[PDB]
């Protein structure tokens, strides 16, 4: 598998992630901002979406924290909450894996 499913729609990402554990996620091309990515993340009761923005140096960010690559952004949010309303960490393996 892969984190990255560029062609998945927002609703398709919701459907896929409803079948996954909290913190599982997919990175897709944004429908609203076509040259950018969106990260969809399974929360406890639903799936929420984050826009991956770019600064004038080409860094990637969600909030204020900047990263030179999507990979570094993902790895940061394994340890730090991606959500400001709840504590949610990105995950991509089950506990049994």
């Amino acid at each position: 598998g892969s984190w990255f499913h560029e062609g998945l729609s927002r609703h398709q990402a919701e459907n896929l992630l409803m079948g996954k554990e909290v913190g599982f996620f997919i990175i897709r091309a944004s429908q609203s901002s076509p040259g950018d990515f969106s990260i969809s993340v399974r929360h406890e009761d639903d799936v929420q979406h984050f826009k991956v923005m770019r600064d004038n140096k080409g860094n990637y960010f969600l909030w204020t924290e900047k990263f030179p690559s999507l990979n570094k952004l993902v790895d940061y949010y394994r340890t730090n909450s991606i959500s400001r309303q709840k504590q949610i960490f990105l995950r991509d393996r089950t506990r049994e894996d």
Partner: peptide, 8 residues
């Protein structure tokens, strides 16, 4: 649509 980190 709606994104959690959309701010002005």
């Amino acid at each position: 649509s709606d994104y959690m980190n959309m701010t002005p």
